[PDB]
Design a protein around this ligand. Structure first.
Ligand SMILES: O=C1CN(Cc2ccc(F)cc2)C(=O)N1c1cncc2ccccc12
Lengths: 300, 300
């Protein structure tokens, strides 16, 4: 029993973290086979950041302007190209530590692990979700750009996030591994606004099912609800709408616990109305939205 | 910015996990140099076991140790509550490591495993009652807890059982239990837990670092007056040592520790008056002072 915000083992990713220096800028890169991936704003100066033109800064770069250091080794760059907001550095060594991997673009509410690195050096791993506003609530100091986020599935790594910047509100924005941002952000130091964040409803339901699986039922009630009546209440608490897809996705947890999805939805409406009255659910005094149905099944 | 429950990267430790099977039971082991460490209860028996005589009756080839490869067991001995299985080949992925024993209130990372395959990593504290609120299921026995410091893995915990309240019990890597527990099927309960006061005060400091400031107050208290409120709320007494340890964060933020106790003494009586701190509605006690520093400064 017990329930933790549990990350994936970071070792397959630890072996791909390199350092990439351009001019006076240093960030982290991701070494797979003979391609090093990193965010393109490593080619930027302090005057650039308001309105850089990256095609024009890259054309001015030769292979040997890119200091790539894999731990002790200095990798020789034999080629550079750009794909959206990620720079791809070709090098003369395939990375022997290269795992089985895929690049995947996730949908908001998906969870993944983050390997925070500074100077190509892993500092720590943690779990988080893509917020519905395509932001992530991370732990990121200056210099963490290039840290990646991932899932592992039977020794195959699914890379899904590269870290590019911190927003004024304190949260973080980034891109998939084909360099396309999540959300409406750009790699530019101009005014940029995180959208209105909202609770991931289908995740909170999953977390409540986990709490039942672990043996607490104190929050259940004798009521049910319609999908539409539930959503009309949830939205007044800034919760994400629940769709039929979500309900289908929860089917396995409902079958395991014998609580209908729409009955679990009724519990949530009452939780939102009453609060928790001095109690806790799986050690949280707030309702927890960073666990997906897959997560709950994996851990339980 | 941000603040998360952050685990050490787990790559050095992943390479040390193997599968160990004696008869019907399978659990995990830790492979270091030419020895495989795993709990001694891998050998009706759990009711009233005499472990010296149960091990007498076993022979090297009773222990099927899978790393794809089967390791040949060439010897078996026991140290306190851990079985040491000698193998023919030394683990070439053996990190630099120590075995250490931590005190309650100290934190560490757990790398949970099943049939020798690493499944997840999370961060957690050793409770004042010497238990761990972890996330383990059937087959997780043998999972290890560690810290890392400047390239050296410090192993501190190995998992044996789950107690009937859902919390977990285990030993240091020399087989000495944490807390007043035994590896045997009887009724065993944990004691009245308390809250790690200094880890709450460190986490309040981390809140001030990240902008949260509403809980401070102009006033001041005495360690005497504070510890009189602490006992009332099942908080650990705050020592003179504890205050010094908070020195660095009382410097960095310019809030004296006895002031912060006033802020916390008020949080204990009046509650948080419908607010949160660092995204939690609970006072968090699983971040040590050094944990706070190490995260808000980016050591790698
Ligand atoms: O390292 C960097 C560099 N930078 C500037 C920038 C990067 C990309 C752009 F497209 C535009 C601007 C930035 O915001 N970070 C950070 C990334 N994450 C967390 C941080 C916390 C504190 C300070 C910086 C943080």
């Amino acid at each position: 029993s017990g329930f933790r915000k549990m990350a994936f083992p970071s070792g397959k990713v630890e072996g791909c973290m390199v350092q990439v220096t351009c001019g006076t800028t240093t960030l982290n890169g991701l070494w797979l086979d003979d391609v090093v991936y990193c965010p393109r704003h490593v080619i930027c100066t302090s005057e650039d950041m308001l309105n850089p033109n990256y095609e024009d800064l890259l054309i001015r770069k030769s292979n040997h302007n890119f200091l790539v250091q894999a731990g002790n080794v200095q990798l020789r760059v034999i080629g550079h190209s750009m794909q959206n907001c990620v720079l791809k550095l070709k090098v003369d060594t395939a990375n022997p530590k290269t795992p089985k991997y895929k690049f995947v673009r996730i949908q908001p509410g998906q969870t993944f692990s983050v390997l925070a690195c500074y100077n190509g050096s892993p500092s720590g791993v943690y779990q988080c979700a893509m917020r519905p506003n395509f932001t992530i609530k991370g732990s990121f100091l200056n210099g963490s750009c290039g840290s990646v986020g991932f899932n592992i599935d039977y020794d195959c790594v699914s890379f899904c996030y590269m870290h590019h910047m911190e927003l004024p509100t304190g949260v973080h924005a980034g891109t998939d591994l084909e360099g396309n941002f999540y959300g409406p952000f750009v790699d530019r130091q101009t005014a940029q606004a995180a959208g209105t964040d909202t609770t991931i409803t289908v995740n909170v339901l999953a977390w409540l099912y986990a709490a039942v699986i672990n043996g607490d039922r104190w929050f259940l009630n004798r009521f049910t609800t319609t999908l539409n009546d539930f959503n009309l209440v949830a939205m007044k608490y800034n919760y994400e709408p629940l769709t039929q897809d979500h309900v289908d996705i929860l089917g396995p947890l409902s079958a395991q616990t014998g609580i209908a999805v729409l009955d679990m939805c009724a519990s949530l409406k009452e939780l939102l109305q009453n609060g928790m009255n001095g109690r806790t659910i799986l050690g949280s005094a707030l309702l927890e939205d960073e666990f997906t149905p897959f997560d709950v099944v994996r851990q339980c």
